[PDB]
Design an enzyme around this catalytic site. Structure first.
Site, PDB file in Angstrom:
ATOM      1  N   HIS A 107      -9.352  80.007   4.078  1.00  0.00           N
ATOM      2  CA  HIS A 107      -9.573  78.784   3.317  1.00  0.00           C
ATOM      3  C   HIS A 107      -8.525  77.713   3.619  1.00  0.00           C
ATOM      4  O   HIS A 107      -8.830  76.531   3.600  1.00  0.00           O
ATOM      5  CB  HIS A 107      -9.615  79.075   1.820  1.00  0.00           C
ATOM      6  CG  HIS A 107     -10.980  79.404   1.312  1.00  0.00           C
ATOM      7  ND1 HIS A 107     -12.112  78.746   1.742  1.00  0.00           N
ATOM      8  CD2 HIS A 107     -11.399  80.323   0.412  1.00  0.00           C
ATOM      9  CE1 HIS A 107     -13.169  79.243   1.125  1.00  0.00           C
ATOM     10  NE2 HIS A 107     -12.763  80.202   0.313  1.00  0.00           N
ATOM     11  N   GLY A 167      -9.305  85.771 -10.040  1.00  0.00           N
ATOM     12  CA  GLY A 167      -8.827  86.875  -9.231  1.00  0.00           C
ATOM     13  C   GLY A 167      -8.328  86.375  -7.893  1.00  0.00           C
ATOM     14  O   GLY A 167      -7.707  87.147  -7.162  1.00  0.00           O
ATOM     15  N   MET A 188      -7.160  82.304  -5.758  1.00  0.00           N
ATOM     16  CA  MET A 188      -7.154  80.841  -5.797  1.00  0.00           C
ATOM     17  C   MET A 188      -7.345  80.255  -4.417  1.00  0.00           C
ATOM     18  O   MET A 188      -6.742  80.715  -3.461  1.00  0.00           O
ATOM     19  CB  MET A 188      -5.886  80.282  -6.434  1.00  0.00           C
ATOM     20  CG  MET A 188      -6.146  79.079  -7.322  1.00  0.00           C
ATOM     21  SD  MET A 188      -7.870  79.022  -7.852  1.00  0.00           S
ATOM     22  CE  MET A 188      -8.317  77.327  -7.489  1.00  0.00           C
ATOM     23  N   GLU A 189      -8.194  79.241  -4.312  1.00  0.00           N
ATOM     24  CA  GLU A 189      -8.473  78.623  -3.022  1.00  0.00           C
ATOM     25  C   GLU A 189      -7.575  77.425  -2.768  1.00  0.00           C
ATOM     26  O   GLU A 189      -7.733  76.732  -1.763  1.00  0.00           O
ATOM     27  CB  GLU A 189      -9.944  78.213  -2.938  1.00  0.00           C
ATOM     28  CG  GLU A 189     -10.815  78.793  -4.043  1.00  0.00           C
ATOM     29  CD  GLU A 189     -11.294  80.206  -3.744  1.00  0.00           C
ATOM     30  OE1 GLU A 189     -10.820  81.150  -4.413  1.00  0.00           O
ATOM     31  OE2 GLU A 189     -12.144  80.372  -2.846  1.00  0.00           O
ATOM     32  N   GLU A 224      -8.611  84.045   1.533  1.00  0.00           N
ATOM     33  CA  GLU A 224      -7.780  82.906   1.154  1.00  0.00           C
ATOM     34  C   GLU A 224      -7.073  82.236   2.327  1.00  0.00           C
ATOM     35  O   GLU A 224      -6.952  81.015   2.370  1.00  0.00           O
ATOM     36  CB  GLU A 224      -6.788  83.302   0.065  1.00  0.00           C
ATOM     37  CG  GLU A 224      -7.336  83.336  -1.363  1.00  0.00           C
ATOM     38  CD  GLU A 224      -8.797  82.929  -1.499  1.00  0.00           C
ATOM     39  OE1 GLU A 224      -9.080  81.720  -1.624  1.00  0.00           O
ATOM     40  OE2 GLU A 224      -9.664  83.828  -1.511  1.00  0.00           O
TER      41      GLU A 224
END
Ligand SMILES: *[C@@H]1O[C@H](CO[C@@H]2O[C@@H](C)[C@@H](O)[C@@H](O)[C@@H]2O)[C@@H](O[C@@H]2O[C@H](CO)[C@@H](O[C@@H]3O[C@H](CO)[C@@H](O)[C@H](O)[C@@H]3O)[C@H](O)[C@H]2NC(C)=O)[C@H](O)[C@H]1NC(C)=O
Ligand SMILES: *[C@@H]1O[C@H](CO)[C@@H](O[C@@H]2O[C@H](CO)[C@@H](O[C@@H]3O[C@H](CO)[C@@H](O)[C@H](O)[C@@H]3O)[C@H](O)[C@H]2NC(C)=O)[C@H](O)[C@H]1NC(C)=O
Ligand SMILES: *[C@@H]1O[C@H](CO)[C@@H](O[C@@H]2O[C@H](CO)[C@@H](O)[C@H](O)[C@H]2NC(C)=O)[C@H](O)[C@H]1NC(C)=O
Ligand SMILES: *[C@@H]1O[C@H](CO)[C@@H](O[C@@H]2O[C@H](CO)[C@@H](O)[C@H](O)[C@H]2NC(C)=O)[C@H](O)[C@H]1NC(C)=O
Ligand SMILES: *[C@@H]1O[C@H](CO)[C@@H](O[C@@H]2O[C@H](CO)[C@@H](O)[C@H](O)[C@H]2NC(C)=O)[C@H](O)[C@H]1NC(C)=O
Ligand code: NAG
Lengths: 905, 142
Positions: free
Chosen positions: A325, A285, A287-288, A322
């Site tokens: 991140h 659900g 993406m880093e 995100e």
């Protein structure tokens, strides 16, 4: 053992650069197996010359370029010797290249090896994502690169520690368009290999882990957007969706958050391109990965017309997490997967600040206690919960890497971060983070380095003084699971701290040096007056004069619940606090008011406080209009509802609740101008939903009139939806319960017809509400047929049927009779089979009910329960506990609750 | 009552969203259209000494969304009439004109002596949609 056998890549092989040329086949072959075949050069320096070179490549057979699988070319000073063989260890799935010739120390060898791989839709490595647009399935190459997945897609030296600059040449069908972390170095070449094949060169990425690097070939439409800072943002979404414009809100949201984060971090985003991709189905659900962030379509896209305010909140929060991140854990490289809990925790806390920046009106910080702290309060309370800290040694296998991602890791981490910021007073914390980012950019890092920087910032400024070092306070909280309960006696001022377990009787196997004694930051109010901050030592008992009160004065602790701890007061104080609450709730802060209702109920479950005291906390709710106290109470009362719904106690309970709910319903009606002026603030909007639902569930004739009118309005002109999205679910369910078969049929027709997943989900929940026994049985039969209900959807439908009280018996029988067919479909593949078992037994409080469960377990033991087997043991234990309560305290609770409810009626 | 001069009249766009109890109710953001007076649209101070001041109501309906495109239907249909308690005079937009030296129609409460109050009239209830602030008095203007 062998270096290749070891999971860790040997340090000696360090990748200076990777040039990757890959050709995925998006065309089915004669075999029908889509295949990614490419030749990738490994440009690397050997710190210690090694004859055998270990590459992390998973499940890749190697094509031979001319004579050898690996062809090595060295230019000028750089020298490369062609490698004789490629072998893959079965145990570790790592490519090993075996070269007879000894390597030359610290020299650049470029190893170009052709490899053949098969694209399979396992959402790992190189995989295919399929979306149906206008009735046509569309094939897109996608890369999952997290952990072991990067190796499957391409040979790489895969480690967070190993960092390379990636130059990518992507050969793909011309119609599809390639993407990579970096901007394209060169334009796609139409006929370089074939007219169909389009080859796109990509710029060398800034040094990063191979897992961070990702490349996506997709048919998604794009509308390019450039920031003043020149970072190129925008979204990758299907062309019909672009016409819809659902992604526009997300695009609007991203830019301010990026700027805000950049100011706090004090570092501009290194990458000039950040791409948000609306993957049609993404299991994570989110993406880093640095540069390329791929999200599930639901999280990324918000539809104004059909989606609730909760959905809007979801979009903003996920984007912020995100974005955080990219600066943290990517620019400053994360040392290993073991430090993930810190990175996720930092990101979640930061995401709330970013979301608040994006929407000033919403008090997201107030919401954090309910969303994160309260949610892990339940998990931490269970004795089985793991310690927050994770060792590097512990995390080795890919499964271990998956284990680090867990709810405790993100949510508890955010709560500890909030507490840390409060002791560091924000500015010092911000300074430390900024300095750490600049000092350690592009270096693998540990939490201690960040902590040292915060401590250094505190050292620079003498205005704020911490009795204990930042690292020391933080360690106590991070090392051990759980939270303490602080009990204060007003008459003497004594304070006592002990660990909280929700279960009255439990054993905690895990051992900590601190033994659950924690340094506690205490903020106190006495009789409405703030007292100087007191830092509790990690000792069980201390006496402080400020806490001591005489006569009328009362004491309060943990203002705003900044600390991760429960609080208790002496009975006289509790009475005084309760009395104060009836007379004036203003002196008490809102977060504290919510805290008292939540705390009393939790203490009552553990039996620290009497059940009547928890009920006394509900008494002031008549006065209370705020969302947070009411929400805490409703959640606590759910256990009571399940246990007493079939019992005689329900009738008195309903009356007491009706009396407490009615002023709030009336107040809300007056503020919302009879339910049309929905409150702008998020917290207020949430309470509007709570009021309507509770009022309808227990009495409140006015609520029923409103629900009936709204449903009738929907039935006329069904395609356009009159009902407000936040309130859509409540009206639908209530109407079906009041209504006959005709109501159920209308909803069923709509459920099949609706394209939107969200709308279909709402309709599916409503169908279960119907009162008649026969209707419920027809619905249960419908689920087995594939056309009527999709397989993923089936588990959810069964859970909702169990929730209806009339339906609970019917669902239980159906589940026993049709167990084998369902088990084959969902026990295998872990499709929420455990969740299905958990949905049943929620209302089970009797000995007879327990006996039926035991019989089913014996009868279907031979068939097996697949994923549900552990859940079955858990469900039985939960049922036993409810009856056990009756054996020790619930028989009294049933009598008392009736008496209390009768008195309060 | 006398008008020295009678030569633009405000139109109140009416936003009506149903309560869900079936009662028609007036809604916020109903727009009284104020024509540009010289440079400024919001405040119209008539050059003419006296005002025709006709009121026109356009009924618009919203299911829940801000968009008011859906036409007013059934109970929701409404008309807007301006009568003000705050101004000393009742001022139900009468031909009779009471005092005034300078009449303005400020959309800003600050700087305005009294507010004309426009009320949507629905069969179930009368609800005041907006207060039109008026910088309110002189012998010279009737
Ligand atoms: C918001 O809604 C409240 C509550 O309305 C309630 O639900 C509706 C479906 C209707 O059925 C209402 O009758 C019901 O009470 C409204 O308050 C209510 O206003 C009505 C209309 O004036 C009142 O009905 C009157 O009752 C008196 C009795 O003395 C009769 O003489 C009248 O002939 C008339 O029938 C009703 O008493 C009143 N209810 C309450 C709780 O006081 C309210 O008007 C509404 N607000 C808005 C913004 O319209
Ligand atoms: C009176 O005028 C105001 C403007 O001063 C009108 O409010 C505006 O209504 C439009 C149409 O719904 C809104 O546009 C919307 O924008 C959002 C995105 O921001 C979009 O998702 C919607 O689909 C729609 O396009 C506009 O934002 C809104 N402005 C304000 C101030 O909220 C009002 O509706 C008018 N009332 C009457 C009686 O016509
Ligand atoms: C003031 O805070 C700064 C920020 O951390 C500290 O400067 C660091 O000094 C340490 C050595 O003590 C270096 O390892 C870091 O690289 C420095 N960070 C940078 C680049 O500023 C400084 O130590 C603090 N001063 C005091 C009195 O604690
Ligand atoms: C506890 O939280 C409340 C609620 O957010 C805080 O109240 C805010 O105070 C700030 C400045 O201190 C104001 O700018 C906001 O308007 C207030 N918010 C609301 C909605 O009241 C309060 O300051 C916090 N108390 C403590 C002990 O820090
Ligand atoms: C909950 O509140 C009730 C009343 O609201 C408390 O009952 C009172 O108890 C005090 C001393 O315990 C007596 O002086 C009163 O006469 C009682 N009032 C009534 C009307 O019974 C009850 O003790 C509270 N619960 C707890 C456990 O503190
Ligand atoms: C309202 O009626 C007008 C005139 O027929 C029409 O243009 C408009 O589409 C209608 N609005 C809606 C959406 O009901």
């Amino acid at each position: 053992s062998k270096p290749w056998n070891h999971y860790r890549l040997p340090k000696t092989l360090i990748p200076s650069s990777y040039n990757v040329t890959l050709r995925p086949y998006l065309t089915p072959n004669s075999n029908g197996l889509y295949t990614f075949k490419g030749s990738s050069t490994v440009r690397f320096t050997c710190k210690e010359s090694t004859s055998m070179i270990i590459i992390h490549s998973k499940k890749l057979n190697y094509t031979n370029i001319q004579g050898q699988r690996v062809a090595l070319r060295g230019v000028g000073g750089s020298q490369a010797p062609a490698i004789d063989r490629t072998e893959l260890v079965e145990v570790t799935e790592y490519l090993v290249v075996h070269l007879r010739e000894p390597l030359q120390v610290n020299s650049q060898y470029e190893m170009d090896s052709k490899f053949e791989g098969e694209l399979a839709d396992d959402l790992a490595g190189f995989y295919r994502s399929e979306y149906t647009e206008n009735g046509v399935k569309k094939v897109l190459a996608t890369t999952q690169m997290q952990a072991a997945d990067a190796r499957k897609s391409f040979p790489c030296f895969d480690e967070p520690a190993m960092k390379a600059t990636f130059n990518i040449t992507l050969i793909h069908p011309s119609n599809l368009v390639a993407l990579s972390n970096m901007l394209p170095r060169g334009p796609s070449v139409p006929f370089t290999e074939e007219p169909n094949w389009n080859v796109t060169e990509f710029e060398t990425t800034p040094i990063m882990s191979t897992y961070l690097l990702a490349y996506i070939v997709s048919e998604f439409k794009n509308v390019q957007e450039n920031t003043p800072s020149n970072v190129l943002i925008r979204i990758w979404a299907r062309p019909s969706a672009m016409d819809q414009g659902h992604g526009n809100y997300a695009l609007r949201v991203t830019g301010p958050i990026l700027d805000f984060f950049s100011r706090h971090y004090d570092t501009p985003y290194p990458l000039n391109k950040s791409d948000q991709i609306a993957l049609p189905d993404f299991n994570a659900g989110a993406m880093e990965n640095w540069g390329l962030v791929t999200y599930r379509e639901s999280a990324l896209l918000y539809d104004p017309q059909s989606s609730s305010i909760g959905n809007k909140e979801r979009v903003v929060t996920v984007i912020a997490h995100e974005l955080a991140h990219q600066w943290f854990g990517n620019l400053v490289t994360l040392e290993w997967w073991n430090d993930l809990w810190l990175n996720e925790g930092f990101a979640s806390y930061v995401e709330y600040l970013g979301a608040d920046y994006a929407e000033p009106t919403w008090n997201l910080k107030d919401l954090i206690v309910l969303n994160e702290v309260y949610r892990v309060m339940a998990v931490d309370a269970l004795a089985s919960s793991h310690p927050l800290s994770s060792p590097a040694s512990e995390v080795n296998t890919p499964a271990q890497i998956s284990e680090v991602f867990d709810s405790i890791s993100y949510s508890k981490g955010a709560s500890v971060l909030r507490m840390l910021s409060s002791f560091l007073t924000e500015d010092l914390f911000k300074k430390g983070v900024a300095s750490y980012l600049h000092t350690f950019a592009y270096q693998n890092t540990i939490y201690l380095d960040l902590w040292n920087h915060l401590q250094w910032a505190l050292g620079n400024q003498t205005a704020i003084n911490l009795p204990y070092t930042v690292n020391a306070i933080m360690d106590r909280w991070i090392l051990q699971m759980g939270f303490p309960v602080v009990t204060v006696d007003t008459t003497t001022g004594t304070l006592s701290q002990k660990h909280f377990l929700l279960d009255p009787q439990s054993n905690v196997t895990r051992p900590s040096k601190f033994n659950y004694l924690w340094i506690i930051p205490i903020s106190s109010v006495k009789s409405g007056t703030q007292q100087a901050h007191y830092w509790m030592p990690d000792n069980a008992k201390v006496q402080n004069d400020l806490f001591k009160t005489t006569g009328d004065e009362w004491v309060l602790l943990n203002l705003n619940v900044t600390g991760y701890y429960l609080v208790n007061y002496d009975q006289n104080n509790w009475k005084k606090i309760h009395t104060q609450l009836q007379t004036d709730l203003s002196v008490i802060p809102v977060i504290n008011r919510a805290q008292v209702i939540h705390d009393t109920f939790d203490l009552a479950s553990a039996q620290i406080v009497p059940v009547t005291l928890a009920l006394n906390s509900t008494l002031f709710l008549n006065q209370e209009t705020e969302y947070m106290p009411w929400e805490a109470a409703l959640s606590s009362l759910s256990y009571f509802k399940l246990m007493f719904d079939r019992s005689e106690v329900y009738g008195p309970m309903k009356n007491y609740l009706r009396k407490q709910v009615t002023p709030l319903f009336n107040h809300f009606e007056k503020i919302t101008q009879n339910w049309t002026d929905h409150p702008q603030t998020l917290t207020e909007q949430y309470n509007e939903i709570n009021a309507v639902s509770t009022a309808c569930t227990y009495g409140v004739p006015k609520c029923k009139d409103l629900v009936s009118t709204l449903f009738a309005e929907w039935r006329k002109n069904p395609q356009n939806n009159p009902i407000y999205p936040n309130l859509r679910s409540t009206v639908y369910c209530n109407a079906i319960a009041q209504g006959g078969e005709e109501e159920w049929n209308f909803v069923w027709e709509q459920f099949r017809n609706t394209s939107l997943v969200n709308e279909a989900d709402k309709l599916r929940s409503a169908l279960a509400c119907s009162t008649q026994v026969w209707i419920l049985n027809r619905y249960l039969s419908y689920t087995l047929n594939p056309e009527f209900i999709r397989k993923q959807d089936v588990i959810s439908t069964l859970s909702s049927i169990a929730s209806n009280v009339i339906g609970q018996s019917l669902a239980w029988d159906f589940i026993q009779s049709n167990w084998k067919k369902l088990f084959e479909d969902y026990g295998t593949g872990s499709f929420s089979f455990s969740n299905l078992i958990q949905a049943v037994t929620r209302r089970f409080s009797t000995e007879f009910e327990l006996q039926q469960l035991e019989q089913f377990k014996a009868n279907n033991m031979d068939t097996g329960f697949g994923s549900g087997t552990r859940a079955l043991e858990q469900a039985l234990e939960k049922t036993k506990a409810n009856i056990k309560w009756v054996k020790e305290n619930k028989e009294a609770v049933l009598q008392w609750f009736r008496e209390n409810s009768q008195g309060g009626s | 009552p006398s008008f020295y001069t009678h030569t633009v009249n405000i139109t109140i766009d009416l936003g009506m969203k149903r309560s869900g109890y079936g009662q028609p109710i007036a809604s916020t953001l109903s727009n009284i259209t104020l024509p540009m007076q010289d440079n400024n649209t919001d405040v119209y101070c008539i050059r003419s000494d006296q005002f025709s001041v006709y009121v026109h109501s356009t009924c618009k309906s919203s299911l829940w969304d801000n968009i008011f495109k859906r036409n007013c239907t059934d109970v929701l249909d409404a008309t807007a009439v301006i009568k003000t308690g705050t101004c000393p005079f009742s001022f139900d937009k009468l031909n009779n004109y009471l005092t005034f030296n300078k009449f303005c129609l400020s959309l800003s409460p600050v700087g305005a002596n009294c507010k004309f109050d426009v009320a949507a009239r629905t069969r179930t209830n009368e609800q005041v949609v907006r207060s039109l602030y008026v910088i309110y008095e002189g012998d010279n203007i009737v």
